[PDB]
Design a protein around this ligand. Structure first.
Ligand code: NA
Ligand code: NA
Length: 327
DNA sequence: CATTAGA
DNA sequence: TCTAATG
C-alpha cells in the first residue's frame, strides 16, 4: 500500500504504455499481474532477485526493479515520458470517443493536437465529434449542487411520461459524493422484466421527453436499453450557462433493478465485501440477481427482490445506507 | 462483460 | 461480421 509504491507505480506506468502506444497486450499484461503481486507482498522489496522470487516476476521486470531501486528513476520511463508520439496517444485518448486504436491512427496521420483534431473534424465519427466539441466540459467534475438540479429534472419528466416509472440516480452521487463525474440513471418499469419481451419505447419515450424540454442535447448512443448522451442545465437568467455533462440511462427489467441498483451505487469495495459475504451466507450476488448456493459446488434459483433490503435481509446483514456504502 | 457504432 | 470504445 506504500511500502510497495514506486514499484507498483513504475510497473503500472510500463503496462499502460505497452497496451496504448504499443500493441502489446502481453507485456502489458505482464506488468500488471506483476504489479499486482508485488503490491500484495508484505515486505519492503530490497532488490531484484527478491522480487524475482515472485510469481509472475521475471528477469525482465526484476532488472527494472533494480534500476529503479538503484536510482530513483528508470530510463525506459524517462524515455517514454519524453516521446512525443507516445505523448500524443495519451492525450488524443482523452477525447471521448477516441481510444488507443484511433489515437494511434490519428497520430500516424499527423493529428496530434486538439487543434489538428479540429481541422480534420471529418475523420472523426459522431461520437468523437461530440467528444471533441465538449472536450473542456467533459473533463470538469459535476457539483452535487448541480447533481441535485439534474436529478430533479429527470425525475420530474420521467414521472410525467409514465407514472409507473422507477428511476434512480446511482453512482457516488448516490453515496453522498461531493461531486460526480457523469450522471447514471437506472430505469425500469413494471411492464418490463426478465421474460416480457421488451418494450423499447419504454427507453425511448423518456429520452424523448428529456430532449423535448432541452435537458438532453446530444446523443452519443441510443439503443433499446441503453441511451448514452449529453445534458445541460438551463442557463438561468443570463450571465452563467452550465457545462455540457455526460449522462447515461439504462432500462432494466423491473425484476432485476435493486441488485443492479445495489451494484451501481457501489462502492467498488462495498460490493466485493458484501459480495464476499453473501458467499459464506450461502449465496451468490451479481449485477442482476442473487442465487442461493447449493452444496454440489454451485447452484441457481434467483431469489425474489423488492428493495435493497430484500438483498441485505437475504445475506442477513445490516441495511447500509448508501452514505455508508463506502467499503 | 455487455451494449452500440461503424464499415 | 468483427472490432472499437464506454461504462
Ligand atoms: Na519467479
Ligand atoms: Na477517450
Amino acid at each position: 500500500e506504500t511500502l510497495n509504491g514506486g514499484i507498483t507505480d513504475m510497473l503500472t506506468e510500463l503496462a499502460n504504455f505497452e497496451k496504448n502506444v504499443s500493441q502489446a497486450i502481453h507485456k502489458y499484461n505482464a506488468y500488471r499481474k506483476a504489479a499486482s503481486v508485488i503490491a500484495k507482498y508484505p515486505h519492503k522489496i530490497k532488490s531484484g532477485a527478491e522480487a524475482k522470487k515472485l510469481p509472475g516476476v521475471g528477469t525482465k521486470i526484476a532488472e527494472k526493479i533494480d534500476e529503479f531501486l538503484a536510482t530513483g528513476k528508470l530510463r525506459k520511463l524517462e524515455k517514454i515520458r519524453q516521446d512525443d508520439t507516445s505523448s500524443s496517444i495519451n492525450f488524443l485518448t482523452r477525447v471521448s470517443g477516441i481510444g488507443p486504436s484511433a489515437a494511434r491512427k490519428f497520430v500516424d496521420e499527423g493529428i496530434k493536437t486538439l487543434e489538428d483534431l479540429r481541422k480534420n473534424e471529418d475523420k472523426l465519427n459522431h461520437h468523437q465529434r461530440i467528444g471533441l466539441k465538449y472536450f473542456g466540459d467533459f473533463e470538469k467534475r459535476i457539483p452535487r449542487e448541480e447533481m441535485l438540479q439534474m436529478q430533479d429534472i429527470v425525475l420530474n419528466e420521467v414521472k410525467k411520461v409514465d407514472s409507473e416509472y422507477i428511476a434512480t440516480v446511482c453512482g457516488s452521487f448516490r453515496r453522498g459524493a461531493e461531486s460526480s463525474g457523469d450522471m447514471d440513471v437506472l430505469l425500469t418499469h413494471p411492464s418490463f422484466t426478465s421474460e416480457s419481451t421488451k418494450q423499447p419505447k419504454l427507453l425511448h419515450q423518456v429520452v424523448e421527453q428529456l430532449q423535448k424540454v432541452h435537458f438532453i442535447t446530444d446523443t452519443l448512443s441510443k439503443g433499446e436499453t441503453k441511451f448514452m448522451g449529453v445534458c445541460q442545465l438551463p442557463s438561468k437568467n443570463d450571465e452563467k450557462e452550465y457545462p455540457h455533462r455526460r449522462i447515461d440511462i439504462r432500462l432494466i427489467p423491473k425484476d432485476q433493478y435493486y441488485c443492479g441498483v445495489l451494484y451501481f451505487t457501489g462502492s467498488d469495495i462495498f460490493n466485493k465485501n458484501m459480495r464476499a459475504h453473501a458467499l459464506e451466507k450461502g449465496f451468490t450476488i451479481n449485477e442482476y440477481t442473487i442465487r442461493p448456493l447449493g452444496v454440489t459446488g454451485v447452484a441457481g434459483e434467483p431469489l425474489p427482490v423488492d428493495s435493497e433490503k430484500d438483498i441485505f435481509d437475504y445475506i442477513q446483514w445490516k441495511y447500509r445506507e448508501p452514505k455508508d456504502r463506502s467499503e
